[PDB]
Design an enzyme around this catalytic site. Structure first.
Site, PDB file in Angstrom:
ATOM      1  N   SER A   1       5.139   1.835   8.499  1.00  0.00           N
ATOM      2  CA  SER A   1       4.590   1.304   6.849  1.00  0.00           C
ATOM      3  C   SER A   1       5.882   0.176   6.948  1.00  0.00           C
ATOM      4  O   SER A   1       6.492   1.539   6.672  1.00  0.00           O
ATOM      5  CB  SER A   1       3.780   1.159   6.012  1.00  0.00           C
ATOM      6  N   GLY A   2       6.256  -0.724   6.605  1.00  0.00           N
ATOM      7  CA  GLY A   2       6.914  -1.495   5.072  1.00  0.00           C
ATOM      8  C   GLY A   2       8.524  -1.639   5.958  1.00  0.00           C
ATOM      9  O   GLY A   2       9.178  -2.692   6.270  1.00  0.00           O
TER      10      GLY A   2
ATOM     11  N   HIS B   1       0.935  -1.521  -0.025  1.00  0.00           N
ATOM     12  CA  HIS B   1       0.259  -0.002  -0.079  1.00  0.00           C
ATOM     13  C   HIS B   1       0.839   1.262   0.479  1.00  0.00           C
ATOM     14  O   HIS B   1       0.266   2.388  -0.093  1.00  0.00           O
ATOM     15  CB  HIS B   1      -1.156   0.409   1.201  1.00  0.00           C
TER      16      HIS B   1
ATOM     17  N   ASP C   1       0.063  -7.510   2.267  1.00  0.00           N
ATOM     18  CA  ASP C   1       0.398  -5.793   1.856  1.00  0.00           C
ATOM     19  C   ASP C   1       2.022  -6.754   2.101  1.00  0.00           C
ATOM     20  O   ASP C   1       2.615  -6.058   2.950  1.00  0.00           O
ATOM     21  CB  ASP C   1       0.170  -5.150   2.798  1.00  0.00           C
TER      22      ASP C   1
HETATM   23  P1  LIG Z   1       1.824   3.025   7.616  1.00  0.00           P
HETATM   24  O1  LIG Z   1       3.112   4.060   7.272  1.00  0.00           O
HETATM   25  O2  LIG Z   1       0.562   3.722   8.613  1.00  0.00           O
HETATM   26  C1  LIG Z   1       0.331   2.439   9.515  1.00  0.00           C
HETATM   27  C2  LIG Z   1       1.384   1.505  10.636  1.00  0.00           C
HETATM   28  C3  LIG Z   1      -1.078   3.826  10.526  1.00  0.00           C
HETATM   29  O3  LIG Z   1       1.969   3.710   5.598  1.00  0.00           O
HETATM   30  C4  LIG Z   1       0.906   4.838   5.444  1.00  0.00           C
HETATM   31  C5  LIG Z   1       1.911   5.350   4.056  1.00  0.00           C
HETATM   32  C6  LIG Z   1      -0.128   5.100   4.488  1.00  0.00           C
END
Ligand SMILES: *P(=O)(OC(C)C)OC(C)C
Ligand SMILES: *P(=O)(OC(C)C)OC(C)C
Lengths: 228, 228
Positions: free
Chosen positions: B183-184, B41, B89
């Protein structure tokens, strides 16, 4: 381990004790649910003796809830190891049955990228082998953080005289080192299994003879084939 | 990273920053010489925008010898993911060239043993994402130790209403949590890569909404097939 301290109780759930006839023989690393990585030379003088693996242990003697003894179904030494050589000194042991995993017992993945560890990097070595020169064997797991030496340095004449091949790596041995009974154990750098304590006759802690460790990424394909 | 502390300079060699037009977008993990693992994502609406990966960093602005920016050659999202779900994901990014390794740059292997981390276990999450509710972004890497939540509890109606499957896991988020921009990133337990921070629109540091992480062990076959 020479010059180290006692490790926290079960902070290394991957640690194993390869035993011959009820006595600690070498360390090992749980690399999969039913497999342990150790050193090929550890089994040289095994004979009719029984070989078992101890898991979830900190104290080799006191009873601990996490401790469990497993017999071995098969001991697979690397095809190219020899009694008179320190090359290809690896051994895989299949447990009689999958291990019962828990907070005190879990497998450690090994490095698969065949690139050397950067000199200066501090790596952790743990074991139940020789604690001092008097030959004192400890009851609890000990460990030391050692710096990785450059092969160019390690291969110096007055050092290992060019015996450290590309499948081997060196770490310091100045007053801190891995000794007899620590063979087969892990050399964990940054949480990753990068090496295995190589088996061979060596004085513990002589700065002129750095410790030798088998680079586990140099044998990723072989490990994979045995575990199939 | 809500409620954590600055991480030791380059003590996590595998940590990567995924960038969109020169700005930190998401986190990543160097997983092989030319591949970085991240969240699908993250690159939702990136398309033909310039994506790149920053290796060897601590500070996002200050020059450090170990830093190096790489162009992304191929973005391989998991084929079962869809924009409306936190499922599958995962995204693999092929770098323009094999990354130059050294003390502050080195790949991290992922757990292959598909088993749950025991609840209560403390795992480490790192990132350059928002550090407070005011949306303040830090310059250097941050991290926090979080307790793993059991899936049944995380699945509670008040939490993630049956959304957490066997390929997912949770950690408590009571004022300590991963956040926007994290994220990631990696969820490392006992030095082992165990999960990737799931990207999704979710509230930060709220006890009723535990952090969700993708279990890498359940995707190891997909990963292997792509990196070969
Ligand atoms: P992630 O950084 O978000 C969750 C840990 C809240 O993805 C974003 C770039 C939408
Ligand atoms: P290992 O326990 O240790 C050497 C490095 C001295 O090997 C023994 C069993 C010979």
């Amino acid at each position: 381990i020479l010059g180290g301290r006692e490790a926290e109780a079960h902070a290394r759930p991957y640690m194993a004790s390869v035993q011959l006839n009820g006595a600690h023989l070498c360390g090992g690393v749980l690399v999969a649910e039913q497999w342990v990585l150790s050193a090929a030379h550890c089994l040289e003088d095994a004979a009719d003796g029984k070989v078992q693996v101890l898991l979830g242990a900190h104290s080799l003697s006191q009873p601990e809830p996490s401790k469990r003894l497993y017999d071995v179904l098969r001991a697979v030494p690397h095809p190219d190891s020899q009694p008179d050589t320190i090359d290809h000194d690896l051994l895989l042991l299949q447990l009689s049955e999958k291990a019962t995993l828990g907070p005190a017992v879990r497998p450690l993945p090994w490095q698969r990228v065949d690139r050397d560890v950067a000199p200066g990097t501090l790596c952790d070595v743990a074991g139940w082998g020789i604690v001092n020169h008097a030959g004192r064997r400890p009851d609890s797991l000990q460990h030391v953080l050692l710096p990785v030496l450059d092969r160019a340095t390690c291969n110096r004449r007055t050092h290992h005289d060019g015996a450290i091949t590309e499948r081997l790596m060196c770490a310091e041995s100045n007053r801190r080192d891995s000794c007899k009974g620590d063979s087969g154990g892990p050399l964990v750098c940054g949480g990753v299994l990068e090496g295995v304590v190589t088996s061979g006759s060596r004085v513990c802690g002589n700065r002129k003879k750095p410790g030798i460790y088998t680079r586990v990424a140099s044998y990723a394909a072989w490990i994979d084939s045995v575990l199939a």
